[PDB]
Design a protein around this nucleic acid. Sequence first.
DNA 1: TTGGGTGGGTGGGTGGGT
Length: 20
Amino acid sequence: SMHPGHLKGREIGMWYAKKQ
DNA sequence: TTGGGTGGGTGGGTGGGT
């Protein structure tokens, strides 16, 4: 409800690698 | 043959690889 999760690859790593 | 640890693992492996 806050993170993508549906992303695959650097897509999610560059979306918020800052975890949460 | 579909990224890498020049990002992290109280994001996850019902996402893929080193």
